[model samples]
Structure formats: structure tokens, C-alpha cells
Target chain A: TTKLVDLVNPEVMAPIVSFELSQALRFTPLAQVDNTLTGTPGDTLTFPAFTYIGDATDIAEGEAIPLDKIGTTTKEVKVKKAAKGTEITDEAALSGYGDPVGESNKQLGLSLANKVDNDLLTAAKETTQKATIEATVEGLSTALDVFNDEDGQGYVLIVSPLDASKLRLSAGKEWLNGTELGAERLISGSYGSLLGAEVIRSRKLAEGEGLLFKVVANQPALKLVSKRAVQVETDRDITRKVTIITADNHYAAYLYDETKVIDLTIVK
Target chain B: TTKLVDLVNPEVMAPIVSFELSQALRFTPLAQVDNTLTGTPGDTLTFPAFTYIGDATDIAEGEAIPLDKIGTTTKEVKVKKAAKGTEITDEAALSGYGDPVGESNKQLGLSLANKVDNDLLTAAKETTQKATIEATVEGLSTALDVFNDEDGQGYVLIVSPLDASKLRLSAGKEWLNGTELGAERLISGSYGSLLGAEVIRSRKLAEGEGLLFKVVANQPALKLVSKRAVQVETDRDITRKVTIITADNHYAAYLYDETKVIDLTIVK
Candidate 1:
């Protein structure tokens, strides 16, 4: 019989965030409904439709306003007309905005339709939602202010929050209802669920209120464009034992493979 | 740097004799005809007369007989009535022996009708024709008999002829008629045509004929099946070097790549 040597357990890994999107925008071909009485037919036509979500003041020039940003209140996103090449900045600047809306209005409808088809823009919205909820999860840490590419692609930059003073906010246990939550909320919530932890505490980083955990893993950039959700789980428990088993109920939602051997070393 | 070797002329190769059996005598299938009669009440009813290829003798023992040996000049060959278990042999006494005059009669009308759906039998007939031609060609060289397997597969056994014999056969002047001649005949004649060359001479062998030549090559086996023929050349000069040329003639047939290559090499 040989002597057995002790070995250190492998590192515990967890997904800090996860979300998916299914593109919903459709492009309809322009129809010349009243070709019978036009002086001359133009080759192409464009439409303009203004979209608003929440109180985000007139999406900064060149910024894309996500569909999920709009809340359930009387958001009042309107479509109005302006001459070709006219630059209208905000909702307040549309006082003399051209002709009244018509049932056969083509330009406004077509423009809004085209903007939604941008893949990068869709992905940015999805990343923003994922970053928000993942930052709230406990143990697994993240930073504030998600970074998005100016070109429309989305990437999340994470900073660890380890100290109590660093915690700026505490996420309350609230079930997300269908109508009140936007697309971003659903994605971020999904990421929190996959990480097997939640944001029990958050604090300001400049105040040096929290400890920073070294970046252990950085996922390759991902783009979310549609309203879809995906959750993945690992067999090993990544949470440190420093926290009590107060929420054993959390593990109940997922189906764990029983055949996997657990490495007890990760528990704090 | 590699130096190129001087080009050496390829010696004329002797053609190998290949044979295949195209025909075989086998027992015919049992004949079953629908003889149901249909008629309305009070209407005169007439039964349609049924005609068969051969008379009772052809179906006497239900054994296939060689058409050539049937010795009948009639359009149809007849079989005489015999006991169900009568054995058929070359010397076996045949009942109702008649002149082989019905060969054409049997083939023209009723026999052709019976063969309407018999693809295997039709293929067998074609095989028999090809086999016969191959066998006759093989007689010009020292070759063993052809063997045929079930499903009509055939193989040839033979010894390669000498180069002188090939050259002689190739140089012989013969008018190339698409009819009455097949690719096999062309190949065999190639050797005879070249016999006049001073570099080649022939001698009788113990088993067959041999040729003595300054240079010699052994031809590979050739197989011809399921191919179409086209006329290679329409006119030829007898005195000048008979330049072999190919044209789009119906008599020109396509052979399997292997067969085509072997045949082409024999001409050179």
C-alpha cells in the first residue's frame, strides 16, 4: 500500500451573468396603394417614427433607445412628419413638424421598422439588462455602469464589490411581473438566477466601502438582440461556506446532477 | 538539378484474347394466363383465343432448348407433349421432332408479347449474342473457354498473343463496316493488319500461334458490356499511312473506361 497525498481542490466557477434575445422586428416591403393618381412615382420611400422609453430624454443623438426602456405608463411615443433632411432633436422641438399623421403614413412606420433590425443595437439592450441584475447578486461581484460599444455592439465591464462600505444599494426580493418589467429586467434577472447568488448589498466604490475580488474569468463578448432567456448551471457549488444556508430554497429551482462529486474546499 | 532521360519508344504490345458467354439455356418459367370470361345475359359470348410461342413440344419438359439446335424454319418452335419428369439431353429422344422452321414465328408475335415484362430474359438474350461474338474472336488465339455465373456475370481466360501477331492483325486492310463488325472485331483485326511489318514475324506455337518481334508488350484484359458504338472513321486510304481518326458517327460506341483504354492501346 502506498501513502496517499493530499491535493488542493479545483477552483469553483460560476456564471456572473447570462441572457438571450430573439429578434422580433420584421421588414415589410413598401406598397404603392394609390398608384392611380400620382404625378410621378418615386424610386424609394422612407418613414419616421419616434420611439420613447421611460423619461430617457430624447435618446442622445446617434444613441439607440431600446424597446424594453419603455414602461407601462402613458409613455406617449409619437410619430410625426418633417421634411426630408429635417433634424428634430427632442419631443419638445416638434412644434411645427409638418403634416398631420395619416392612416397611409409610410415614412415614419418604415424608419422605426428599419432601426429595430440593427443586431448590435438589440444586443446592447440585452447586455445592459444582464449587467444590472448580475451586479445585484451576492458573493459574485460586478461594477456599476455597463459599457456598450458606440458602434452598437455590447460588452460588459465588471468590477468586484467585496467590502460592505462599497455596497451602494441592496436588491429587494421582488418577483418580476410580466407588464411592469422591460426586456432588460428579464435578462438581468436570468443572469442572477444562473449565478446561484443575488445582490444582497451594494456600496459606492470611491468611498472604499467594499473589497475587490480579482477578476477570475472574463466571458467573451456576447450580443443580445431579442427577448429570449437562457440559464446554465454547474454541478459543483461555487459559494463559499462563509454565508449560512439561509436560502437553501434557492437551489430548489434547478435540476442538479447527483452523480457529480462535490469539492468542499471552495467554502469560505 | 535532374537530367531528363532520352525518350524511348514503347514497343507494340500483343493483344490478349478475352471471351465471355452471352447465352445459356435454362428452364423457362411456368406459363399462367388469365382466361376469365365476361358477358351480359342474352348476349352472345365468345372466348378470346390465346396463342403461345411454341407448340406443346416446347413446353413438354419445361426445359429450355437452344434455338439454333431446335432445327425449325417456322416462325415458332414447338414442343411436343412428354411426361412431366422427362429428362432433356443432347442424345435424348425428342418427340414430335420437326424442321426448325418456327424459330422466327415464335419470336415475332406471341414470344415477343410474352417477353414484354421479362427484362432479365431480354438481358440474357443480349448476353448470349455478345458471348457468341467473343467466343468466335477468342478462337483466333490460344484462350480457354468462358465461364458464366448466375445473374449472367461472365469472365474470360486467355494467354497473351505475341507482338508480331498483333502488328500483323492490325495492318490487314479490311473495310470497317459498323454493321457485321463490333469493337471486338476491330481489336482482333488490328494485329492481323500489322503482320506485314518487317520487324514482326509469326510462328506456330504448340497450343496456338506466336509472333517474334524486335520489341514486345503484353496487353491487359478488356471487358465490353453495356456500351454504345459509334463509327470511328468513314473513309480510309489504303496506300498512305492509315491515319486513325475519330468522328461523331453513330457506329462509334462508348465502352467502360478500362475496356476503351485497352482497345485504344491495342491499335497503337
Candidate 2:
């Protein structure tokens, strides 16, 4: 029977600039590709599936220049703004240690990013282009060689922390006895390009689970079309004085090119 | 191996926040340059490639601005941040199974730091100045000379954890023999701007090989692209009555100039 005060709506539009979290993830490694549509609600986005144009044969002079289709097929990427919002009633905001709405904004952004992450991982798994043969060194080496041989663009390795730890631990031998024999530059550190790929550990993959994927400007490995792009909004239940702090965003994810992704069933 | 508990969460949900990890890796130690664009999904970015203008010719009184042409070559780079928290699954708790919904649980910050460490090492290797020689003194001295001669700023000695031990041990001439070469810092303490060059150890080099490379604060030898900085956020799942917290970041790395750095190969 008391008057209601709405703080969430007034504070919800607060714009945030992320300065601390740069370069701290594997999502960008997925190669964000392009999609049409203005990122509006119910907008349909489409991704093109490309195939290999094996060894362009010798043509009689210049009679019909390599007539290979670039877009072999099309993979439809449906689009819809994905938003995650949480309502904060007055009681919590008033009793909270810090600002409740502020917390909501931050967490919503995280939730949305994870959503995109799931799509990229799924895309990697769906691809038949996987190397399930060996442990970290061998499997990644083989995958890298083949990926390179196939003209794969630059790449990234997403593995479970367990596997990353294993790879890092296997390196202890080098510390004690110098495992490498011939040439070197990493010639030694906890660092070195394990070949050419950037290795990233993910909580999603298992200890031995891993994936190698391509990244390029001309194309994308996964489709990430954003509409609202992680934002916060404040609303009030006029009759309730409820300071509803909600974070929302919209996006779509799809496999742009299966060739750009590969999975490792197990990486020791 | 303890029957491989493999309790890694299948969700592999990734949550990242970068700060402590940046120091754990080699990338930040290298930067310090600029390159640009494509920061957007479909946008094509072009960055000029300048072949360092270290020694330009002298000019006369009436010189025509000493016309030294600069070349331009371009490439692209893109974006994303960091956050962390865990939720419990009823299934995993009720049963004695491995994991019901877990990800790697590897510290995302640490894993990413490792990833960047590899990239930094690669940049060092791609350097044009690599010296190979007998250790103890000759090899490092020669590398130091050439690297210093090249006007290399921010030079660092990346020795194999093992090889680093070899060099430090070879200090037997000083350790037990007592020949203080007027250098005091690194000697009386566990730290020193080791010759104004930090001596870094990595496990990636040859069994025991390592490299000494140059780093520039203003004109760097590598480029770090941050699509999105590290960010921490949280949201509530009303339906599940659970609060979700996340950490995130996005970025990439590439070499800007190979000649700026050098590799030191020491196998002792």
C-alpha cells in the first residue's frame, strides 16, 4: 500500500565501454563471417557454402576461363535478436552491496557472448573435417599440415584446459633435458607458436577434446550477426515500483563454411 | 593415469578476463605498433607495411625534401572480453557419474595467456636476426651485439628453461670463481633489468634452445588486435532462479616486422 519507486528504468540505458577484457577469449578465433539483414527482429540471414575446385585443368588457351562455381550451395542462417534480461525488484536493489542494474548489464553481455560461443563450437563439431588420429602434438600437427595443404587460411586451436595443461606439462621434459634436438627460437619458453596456430583452452571441450579452425577476412568460419549487441534496458511495473533491470541483445549463428572448421575427438 | 577421471564439463562454457595472464604470455612484452581495420564482420581493412626507416641519408642545403618513398601493404584484423561463475546440475550431484554439465574449468585467463605466449614466440622466430653459437658467453654476446647494433630497443633474452640454466650455471666463472664484471643488480638479487634486457624462459624452444629478441615500445615488431576488450558481467536466470556470471575478451596477433627482432639459439 506504499508508493513505488522505479530506479531500473532510469538507470538501464547506461552505456558501457569494455576496457579490461580485451584479447581474453577464443570466440574471435572462430572467424566472424558476414551476414545480410540489419540485425532486426525476424530478419533472415543466409550463409554461402563453398566447395573445393580441385586442380584447375589445362584449358585450350583462354576459352572459358576456369568455370568453377564459387558458392557451391547455400546454407540458410536464420536471424533473430537474442536477448538475456533479468528483472530486479526494488527489494534487492535497495539491499544490494553495489549497483544491481550495473551488475545486470555486465552479466547479460557475458551470457550473450557464451551463446555465440556455443554456435561456433557446434559448427566445428558438425564439420566432417576432423583429425582424430593422435595426441596434442601429432593431432594438431597433422591437422595444421592438412589445413595448410588445403589452402586453409590462418587458424586457431580451441582445446579443453585439461589438454592445454597436458601440452604445457609435456613441455617439462624440455625444461629438464631439452626435448628438442635440432633447430629452435622458442629455442625456449612456456611460449612458442606450436607450429602456426594459436592455441586456446575452452571449458566446453573435454580434457582431450579440441578443434582447429580457420580465420580470414575474405570469409568467416562462423556466422555471428548481431542486432542489438548486448545492451541493458530498464523497465518498471508501474503498479509495482519494481526496478526491473534487464540486459538484452539479438544475434544469429550459423556455419558459414564447414571447411573452415575441424574437430579433434581427443588430444591426449 | 588414475583411469582418467575426465570429469571435464561437456558444456565447455568459456568465461575469460585478461590482465594477470597478459604478463604470463609473451605477446604484450612485444608490442608495444599499429595496424588496422575489418574490425567489422564484412569490412575489409588495409594496413600499410613500412619497411622501417632506420637510416635515412643526410640532406644538403638545397635538397628536395630528401624524397624517401614509403610503401604501403595492407592486411586485416577483427574483435570481443572477460568474466566467471559456476552453476550446479542436479544430475551430476545425484549420480556418481563423471560430469553432467561442465566445461574445461581451466582458468580461461591462463589458457589465453598461453595462446598469446605462443604467438609472441612465433613473432620472435620470424625475426631475421637469429644467431647460433656455443653458449656460456659467445652465443648470447654475439646475439646481444647484433641485436643491440640493429638499434633494437626492449631486447629480451628468451632462453630455454634448461639452456637458461646452462647459461646461469656457466656463470661458474663468477658463481664460485668470483669475477664481478661491475654488474650489480641481477647479482645481489633475484631480479635485474638483466643487462637492461629481461631474461625470459620458455619451454617451446629446441630441447634447450632459446632466442634473444628485440621489442619496441613505440614502433613494435608485432601487432595486437583487440576486437573487444576484457569485460565482466552478470545476469540472473529467472526461470532457473540462478545467477549467471561471466568474463569475456576478444583479440588477435600478427607480426609487423620480422627484422626488428632477433633469435638466439643456445644449446648447452
Candidate 3:
């Protein structure tokens, strides 16, 4: 029979952290705007750049038609990395109080994912278009007005939990007049809808600052150039009788289009 | 007694890679100039910049000494990340040919370290002081002449294996006239010495180009801002019975002083 003592061995306890790591990867609310791409260190990821054409003009039959050429440019984003590591002592594994290795791995994965969102949110604030509103509902509408055909197919509003609460109160029961809101308000992202935009709650955003951006099916307003995906490695320190686990990601998040985003500050 | 079949398990094999990882980390010849620092994503690391004073003017017996304030400036380097992952299958563990997990971890470590060297070498090519030379021995001296007191206390020459070979043959029997060179040519770095500079071989550098730089004890010409150290995580695929290991590092390598380096191209 397999002994319980052997179950808490460093080799046995290491795999538990992997399950938590996989779980933490799914909790990226603010990073939904990411367009994942492959890249390498010491190199730049090139993104296509082009402008939108104005309204088409009608031409009479057999008449001379106007011809235009679309000017194109390219932007380069260099990928960056974020990582974390923790160790599980042999005593901790034997204690059986709780899963310390699993918990640490979960937080390590969250730390990197949060870093991704925070980078994107930080870049979102660099958008030139800005607005200040006294209330949430009207302010969201004002920000939406900044978008045009070139912006994107859909819209998303990212705000802090405090602002989301303010938004819920700003419109009261009239705001969350949907079935999903009743059940999903307990979560962070996509809690409700407002003015055709999906409302996302992200603690990465500061209470005073928020972002409203367009979501294009083909071209994202924000992009994450990935040099490497989430990687986990573990080793047993024989002398110390401890297992060390590490989680890391190599990526860069940047605002792809300044015109497609609105930086918002709520005075209320 | 533990079953022999159970010894080939994924959990048991994962820690073997850690041992190889520690060995691979010791092979950083090109990254010897790094001044490690801590940083975060979306944040810039600040480094002090100052200019060295010229020769001091001698004062007369009664005359006051001339005093000049050193001009100070600051530079910012944004940290970036690079990472990699691999998986070992259940079949491979049972093969018993050799240690696959240990070998993978060693290569993973080497890959990240090579990335660090490649980045710094790439940045070294951007130095403003450039020279074109046909011969190795004299060309090294020509490049070394570009440095002044502000450059550093010692000098280093970084070259590709091909260039190092050329350097070896360019002077031939006249070159390696030392006891250490008798056995060290079997290695990469510091195989032979030329003039006052230590000749080091790095596969990261291109054969056509080479680098000569000064090494400062306090301030490195190349700085690696580390957002995170090497992290390792591991998990087992229960269904597939495979072990997945990931390794990662977050850092940015950049040239801190253009004047302290010479980008050299050897035509011969």
C-alpha cells in the first residue's frame, strides 16, 4: 500500500502547483483586448498600419472617377518579460494544513497575468483623447462619441470596482436592468451593459482613471506581443529538502491605436 | 519497497532538470559586463550619468586650485522578458537511455543566457565609435585606442568563434606564447590574450563584426535591468503522464555609454 508520508514528498507536491497555475491563467479580465503574437528578444514585432478612407463618392456612368491611394505605415513593439518564483519547504509539505505549493503557484500565475493587464491599462492612459464626467452613465456616452468607423466592430468599457459601484449607483436599478447583471455582479468582468458597450470590472485600473476602447475583430486596440507563453519549472533542493517552483511569461502590451481609446477620469 | 516502475514517474523526473540548470548558468562569457538591477514592467530604471573631468590644472604656490562641477544626467532603461518551456513524456522517462529532463533544463538555461548575451552584443553594435580593420592584432589595438579614462579600468574584446580563430591564426605561433593558452584553446573565453585586452569568444556575435569595450568596476558599459530572476515551475500531465517544465527570466540589456565601446568590423 502507498504510504501517506510519501504523498507529501517534494516530487509529489510539485505537480499540485501546476493545476493552480492553469486555473490562474483564465482570470485575465482587463487583457481581453490582447491580440497575441509571436516574437523574440532583441527583435521587434511589426504591426501593419493603414488609415481609413472617407465616405465614398458616387460617379456618373462613363464619367471620370476619382482615384485614391491609401498610405501605409508600420509600428514595432518590443516584447518584455515578467516572472515570479517560490519555494515549498519539506515541513510545509508535511504539515498538510493546506496546499502551500498550489497556493503559491496560483499567486505566481496571477502576478504575471496582472502584470499584463496593468501594462495594457498603463498604455491605455497614454491615449490622446481624454474626457471628464461628473457621473458614470453620461460619461460613458460622452466617451463613446469619440469613436468612428475606423475604431472597431464593438466597444468595451474598463473601470475599477469602485467606479463600477459608482456606475451601478449612478443609474441605480435602471442601470442593471438585465438578467445577467443579477447573477454576474459577483464577478469582475462583463458585469453589465451600458450604451452598447460591455462593462468590465478590473481592479488594475485606478479609482480615478478608466478606459473606453473599441474592439476590432481583426485589429485589436491593444496588442500583446508574446516572445514566450507561460512557463513553469520546478527543482528539488536536495541539501535543503525543499521544492522551488517558478512561473514566468514574456510579452509586451501596448496601445495600437490612440484614436480608438478614451482616457476617462470621473470627478464624482 | 518502492516499485522500480514507479521510479520512472514524471514527478520523480522533474527535479533532475534543476541540477542541469545550475550547471548551464555558469557559462556566461558575453554577459560578464552586466550590472544587474531590479525593475518592473511599465516602469523605467533610472541610472546616474556623469562626465569625467579633464586633467587637473596645477596651482601656483599661492594660487587657488581650479574647480569645476561635474555635469550629471540620468538615463532610463525599460526591463523586458524572455522565457521558454518544455515537456517530457512518460515514454521518455521509461526509456532509461539517459536523463532527458536534466538535459532539457540545461539547454533551457543556456537558451535564456544566450538571449542575454545576444541582446547585449546587439546593443554593442550600436556604439557610435566604429572602426574597420583588416587584421586582428593591430585592429584590436586600434579599437582599444577609442577609450579614455571615462571608459573604464580594464578592456575586453568580444568576438565570434570565427573571428577568434582568425585572431589565433593572424598571429599564429607568435600569438599564443603563454602556458595557459596551451590548454585553454579547448574553451571559449579568455583562450588567448592580445595586447592589453582579454580575448573572449561568443557565438552570439556575428563573424563580420566584433566589439571592444572598457570594463568599469562601479559602472558597467552594458546594464541588465532584471525585473525577475530565473524562475522554474513544473507540473505533471496526469492523463498523458508527461512532465512539463518552464523557465523564464525578465531583464533588459542596453548600452549605458556609447563612448566606452567601439563597434569593429574585420574585413579579413
Best prediction by lDDT: 3
- i-RMS, each model, one decimal: 49.9, 24.3, 26.8
Taking the tens digit of each residue's C-alpha lDDT, what string does model 2 give over A48-113? 656876686777975887565543665565554444445556776688443545544564565556
Q: B1-268, model 3: which lDDT tens digit per residue?
A: 2344323222233333233332222123434433345442354767686888777776779877777777887878776789899988753464334567777877887778767765765776787888887656777766666664543366777777787776776565556556566447645534556676777666556678777767666666666556678988888853334799999887777777677678788895
lDDT of 3 by residue, A57-167 (tens): 888888886655444556677656576777778987998656776677677777777677666656667778888875566667766766755433366676777777777
- Reference-based lDDT, residue A110, model 3: 73
Clashing pairs in 3: A80-B81, A81-B80, A81-B81, A232-B233, A232-B246, A233-B232, A233-B233, A246-B232
CA displacement after TM-score superposition, residue A19 of candidate 2 (Å): 14
List the per-model TM-score of the A chain: 0.15, 0.64, 0.68
Q: Give me the candidate number with maximum TM-score.
A: 3
How many steric clashes does model 1 contain? 83
lDDT of each: 0.24, 0.51, 0.65
Task: State the fnat of model 2.
Answer: 0.00
List DockQ for all candidates.
0.01, 0.01, 0.01
Q: What is the lDDT of residue A9 in candidate 2?
A: 15
How good is model 2 by TM-score? Answer: 0.39
Instruction: Go through the candidates in order and give the clash count of each.
Output: 83, 49, 8
